[PDB]
Every structure is written in C-alpha cells, then in structure tokens.
C-alpha cells in the first residue's frame, strides 16, 4: 500500500545553473559549426522510454525522467525546473 | 493473468492511470495451495 | 479578505482587443489560489475563460483558441485579460475570482484540487 | 469535452418547501463538483465545494449530495432569499465548464 497522500516522482534542476551550463554549451559548439549560427536545442524524438528519457537508478529505483523542459530554446547570436 | 483496477481514481494529478490494483492467484510454498494477491503495480509494467 | 474589483473599459470596437484587468487587495497574488476569470453573456449561462497561477502558468477555455491571454503583476497585485479579434459575441459581464486550491505536492505537476472560486468580484460590463 | 446537464429547468414552489436541483454529467468526476448560487445579477457565491462539503459561511440548510455521474444540492426549509440562479461545475478536467444553470422562484 501507500501511506498518506499520492505524489509523482520527480527531479529538480535550478534555472540559472542550467541556463549558464547551456550558454557555455552553445559557445564550445560555436566553434566547430561556426559563429552566426544558431543553435537549437530539442527534447528527444522517438524510441523506447530508455532512450526517449533520461534513465537512472536513484536509491534502487528506476527514474525515467522526461528532460523535455530541460532541451527547448534557441540560441542566436530558488526558480527550478521540476521534471516529471 | 492479473484482474487489476485504478488504485486511486479521483487524482487529478499527472499519476492519474499510473499505479493499479491488481489482484491474481499466486502459488505459494505447497503445489496444491493458491494464495490470493493484491499488489500495486505501475501502468508501465502492465499490459492489456 | 481579498475584495476584488475589476475595471476594464468597454465600447471596444470589433476586431479590437480587450483588456481586462482585475485589482487585489487584501491579500497578496503569491496565496495557495490561481486567479480566474470567466464570462456571462447577457441572457446566457455562465462561461469559464481561463485560470492564471502566481508563476505565470496559464489555462484557457479551447473555444477561445489564440484569441486570449493572462497576465499577473505581482508589484501591483494585478492580473488581467487581453481578449483579442473581438467581434459580437463577446459582449457580457466579465468576472474574475479567487479560484482555492488544496496543494499537497508540486503544483507544476497538478498535485493540487480545487475547493471552488470563492470570493468573486462585482463584474465588469463589456460591450462590443 | 465533459457535458454539463442541469434540469429541472426551472421550479416554482413555495416558502418552506424542499427542493432538490440535479446536475448530470457525462464522465465520473469524483466528486470534483462545486455548486454556486446567483442571486439575481448579484456574483455568483460558493454554496458547495467538494460536491458534499458545505462552503464556510453559507446556511446549513443547503446540503450537497451525489457520487459518480450523478450529484445534487437539497435545500431545506426554503426561504425568500434563496430564489435565484443556481450553477454546478466540474473541476475534474479543463475547461471547467459550467453547467446551463436552473432558476429557482
């Protein structure tokens, strides 16, 4: 059974950390695709949960994260983000 | 075969579907005895 | 003890835009409530327009597809309605509410329920 | 979409009298139904919230009933000041649509 209410699994990454961690992303990636080029960043496509979501073992469990909040933006020339 | 239903129907949350209460006949430690079971199962690991 | 009151000038022109803004006070927009509004044509039930929460996430009736859009303002305790392609029958009293919820998890992933649109507004008459 | 179906259309009674207003709906929402009475042009208030759990400072003597498709308000000892419009709407799923309303004199 559970005890008490029912709540979903899920993971916190803060805003600014990953937004600087994708700003710094983008700057590398700039250099072998060149500079004016803008990049986009998307949530994966098809294919099985395992390679559809980000995939991990958390204290014996088995997370399957959606990750589609975390890979969304264009990028051209405490405020977390929760996934399910 | 497993008889299964929604282990909490009036959630409005993302977890609506997801858990079920499944019921089946399990064997047990002697070959001519069945144990009823009820367990909670997620929908991804559960087939229709 | 929220009193809400809304403005929102009518006699728009069709093909305009509304803009409907609702007035808190009492109360802070960062409470355990999204901020509602809905609309009653003159002579016709009672229509819902949409919900807002205080981090800006949004919900809205289909029928209004591409058509409006919410907004809080949290120095101002403000929220409001920018209705646009307005054409004739829009015309009703508009209201907005203090629509309760009950939150036990993380509202980001509806771990929330609702205990009713308590404490409405007056409404305001919106004619095109 | 969820369907909302509100009926009697209308009632005419009495002071004093019980009446019952029946809200139908075409999916079981759980109880996640709320009830609100419009006194006349006056805002719609909160009656019921919960289906059966009655709203903080409304007279007893409206009570919420109901499960699965079906849920009703009964009021009890009917008095002048409750003739009016009377509106149910289901939380369960968006939008949250408003059932037609009765009118009650």
């Known amino acids: 059974d559970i005890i008490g209410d029912i709540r979903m699994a899920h993971c916190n990454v803060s805003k600014a950390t990953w937004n600087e961690t994708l700003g710094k992303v983008v700057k590398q990636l700039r250099k072998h695709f060149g500079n004016n080029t803008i990049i986009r960043f998307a949530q994966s496509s098809g294919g099985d949960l395992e390679v559809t979501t980000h995939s991990f073992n958390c204290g014996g469990e088995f997370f399957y994260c959606n990750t589609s909040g975390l890979f969304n933006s264009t990028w051209i020339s405490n405020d977390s983000i929760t996934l399910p | 075969t497993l008889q299964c239903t929604n282990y909490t129907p009036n959630l409005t949350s993302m977890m609506r579907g997801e858990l079920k209460n499944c019921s089946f006949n399990m064997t047990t430690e002697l070959r001519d005895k069945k144990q009823k079971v009820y367990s909670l199962f997620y929908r991804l690991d559960v087939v229709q | 003890q929220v009193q809400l009151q809304e403005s929102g000038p009518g006699l728009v022109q069709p093909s305009g835009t509304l803009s409907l803004t609702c007035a808190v006070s009492?109360?802070?927009?960062?409470?355990?409530?999204?901020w509602t509004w809905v609309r009653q044509p003159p002579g016709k039930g009672l229509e819902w327009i949409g919900e807002?929460?205080?981090?800006?996430?949004?919900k809205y009736n289909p029928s209004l597809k591409s058509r409006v859009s919410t907004s809080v303002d949290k120095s101002k305790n403000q929220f409001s309605l920018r209705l646009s392609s307005v054409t004739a029958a829009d015309t009703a009293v508009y209201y907005c509410?203090?629509?309760?919820?009950?939150?036990?998890?993380?509202?980001?992933?509806?771990?929330?329920?609702?205990?009713?649109?308590?404490?409405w507004g007056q409404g305001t008459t919106v004619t095109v | 979409d969820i369907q909302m179906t509100q009926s009697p259309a209308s009632q005419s009674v009495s002071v004093g009298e019980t009446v019952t207003i029946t809200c139908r709906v075409s999916?079981?929402?759980?109880?996640?139904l709320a009830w609100y009475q419009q006194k006349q042009g006056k805002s719609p208030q909160l009656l019921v919230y919960?289906?059966?759990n009655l709203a903080d400072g409304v007279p007893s003597r409206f009570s919420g009933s109901g499960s699965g498709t079906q849920y009703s308000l009964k009021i009890n000892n009917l008095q002048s000041e409750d003739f009016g419009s009377y509106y149910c709407?289901?939380?369960?799923?968006?939008?949250?649509?408003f059932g037609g309303g009765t009118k009650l004199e």
């Open positions: 919960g289906a059966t």
């Open positions: 509410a203090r629509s309760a919820i009950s939150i036990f998890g993380v509202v980001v992933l509806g771990e929330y329920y609702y205990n009713g649109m308590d404490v």
């Open positions: 807002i929460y205080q981090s800006g996430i949004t």
């Open positions: 999916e079981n929402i759980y109880s996640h």
């Open positions: 709407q289901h939380f369960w799923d968006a939008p949250y649509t």
């Open positions: 009492g109360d802070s927009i960062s409470s355990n409530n999204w």
